[PDB]
Structure 1
Amino acid sequence: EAPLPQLRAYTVDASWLQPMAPLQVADHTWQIGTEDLTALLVQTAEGAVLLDGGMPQMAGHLLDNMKLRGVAPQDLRLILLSHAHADHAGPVAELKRRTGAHVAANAETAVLLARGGSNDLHFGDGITYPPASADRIIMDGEVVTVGGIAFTAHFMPGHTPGSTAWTWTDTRDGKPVRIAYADSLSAPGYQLKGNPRYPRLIEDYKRSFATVRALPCDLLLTPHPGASNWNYAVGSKASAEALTCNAYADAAEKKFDAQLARETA
């Protein structure tokens, strides 16, 4: 008789796990993750902020790149998240242990993080990672400030209930650069219609496309860089083809609408 199946690891494309050196995005903001997963380090006079960390096994690489940027582990003040899936929040528990950083997140992200991504609305227990606690619960539009740099949360539920865009204003060449780190707008394999675990999924996505269109933004980044047409591997040309917020929302909505019709079909 067949035994029960073995547990299956969450495996990803090699490029998601390919380390890169820090890539400067603006005067204080650096991509310090892998070629295909965003992890943004914002360096202030009173400590650093990390927005996402990628996969669980990226924790050491993140700390190495922080050190290259002059940031010792204890200099990391704050971790912010796009959403609490294993490929973006993976190393949060380990980073908290090794740095003392606090995590700020909305209540939906906090509850998913605290169960390590288990009992996911769509993926069940297939993408579990080490659980972590949120130290500060934030509300829509709330401002979190480190070293004078203000980060504003914009809720954009859909990909997860707690999906969040973060905005802040950096500089380049003496001019302001409004950065928008917008969350995923994909629905990979999701049951969109009549989903008992997420009854208003379609209404939330539709509002979130509108929220993304309206973000203050001179430079858009996304957890998966390809979603906004970044290419981290080509250095100073990485941002050349990057989408606007309007274009990112439009592409996501077209995909969503096509998926909805295919689900009907």
Structure 2
Amino acid sequence: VQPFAIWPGVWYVGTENLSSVLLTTPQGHILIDAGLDASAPQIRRNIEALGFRMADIRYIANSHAHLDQAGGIARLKAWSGARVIASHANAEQMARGGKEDFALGDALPFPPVTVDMEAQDGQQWHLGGVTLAAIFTPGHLPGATSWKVTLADGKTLIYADSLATPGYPLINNRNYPTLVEDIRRSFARLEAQQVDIFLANKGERFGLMDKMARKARGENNAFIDKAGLARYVAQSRAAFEKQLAAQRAQ
């Protein structure tokens, strides 16, 4: 619940398990994701509780354009002056406020927001000694993006997007035809990443609460988890392949 340091220069400012990660630098900050629209005022408070200025955020990066990752972006952009970075498909869905979702339709809208800088696969941004790089990991949404960070101290952090496919029709899905091929390739791309710090779009996917408690009790390396991303992919792959096999049997 309370915001805290994951690692020097890396802070958790999300609301409950909706991840929002602040990378602080002498040139200003990067924020990855922003919860629900309702999370936005709390994220401002959480950043402030850590002693930072939300107005110092220079970039807001989105993993994927669902209401619980991009919902707070419109307000945080407005208040902070940050430039929003996201893949093309996420930018299109954000412009629609989450509507026309291949699986949800218009069921779960959120405040529309304009992406200022479209991310291409492998594209890098540099700020205050930190490098932020986009890793396209489609499947949960066509534009789903994981983010690779090289910190000023040389540590590598990966913020992995969702690999979940909740209720998704996988066979002849004419709204998102390539989803099976995409997600299987995302599994491989992510599990091979060299990573010191493993984070993800929801706290339960990276052990947020257990690691936070250890960290608060003096385990400085609690978020160093070099095999955690590979474990997350394995857990996701097993569930996905069971899903595809079950749907083939329908």
TM-score w.r.t. the length of structure 2 is: 0.91
Q: Deviations over 1:192-243 (max 9, x none)?
A: 1110011111100110001111223112111111123332685235857966
1:247 alignment counterpart? 231
Equivalent residue, structure 1, for 2:73: 92
| Structure 1 residue 132, shift from structure 2 partner | 0.2
Aligned with residue 209 of structure 2, among 191, 213, 231: 231
Deviation of residue 134 (structure 1)? 0.6
- After superposition, residues 1-265 of structure 1 pair within 5 angstroms as 20-170=1-151, 176-231=154-209, 234-237=212-215, 239=222, 244-265=228-249
Q: Distance in 2 between matches of 1:232 and 1:134?
A: 34
Q: Percent same amino acid among aligned pairs?
A: 36
Counterpart of 1:166, as a letter, is W
- TM-score, normalised by the number of residues in structure 1: 0.86
Q: Deviations over 1:56-92 (max 9, x none)?
A: 1011111111122332232111100111100011111
Q: Deviations over 1:156-190 (max 9, x none)?
A: 0000111111111237xxx6431110100000000
Q: Secondary structure at the match of 2:162?
A: coil
Instruction: Tell me: CA distance 1:70–1:230, structure 2 relative to 1, closer, same or farther (3 Å).
Output: closer
- Distance in 1 separating the partners of 2:18 and 2:206: 12
The residue aligned with 1:6 is none
**Partners of 1:101 and 1:86 in 2: how far apart?**
19
Which 5+ residue runs of structure 1 have no aligned equivalent? 1-19
| Separation in 2, partners of 1:93, 1:51 | 13
Tell me what 2:219 maps to: none
The 10-residue stretch of structure 1 (226-235 or 86-95) with the greater mean CA deviation from structure 2: 226-235
1:240–1:50 CA distance, 2 compared to 1 (3 A): closer
The two structures, once aligned, show a CA RMSD in angstroms of 1.8
SS class of match (1:150): strand
Superposed CA offset, 1:120-141 (max 9, x none): 0001111100000010111100
Measure, in 2, the Cα distance between the counterparts of 1:183 and 1:218: 17
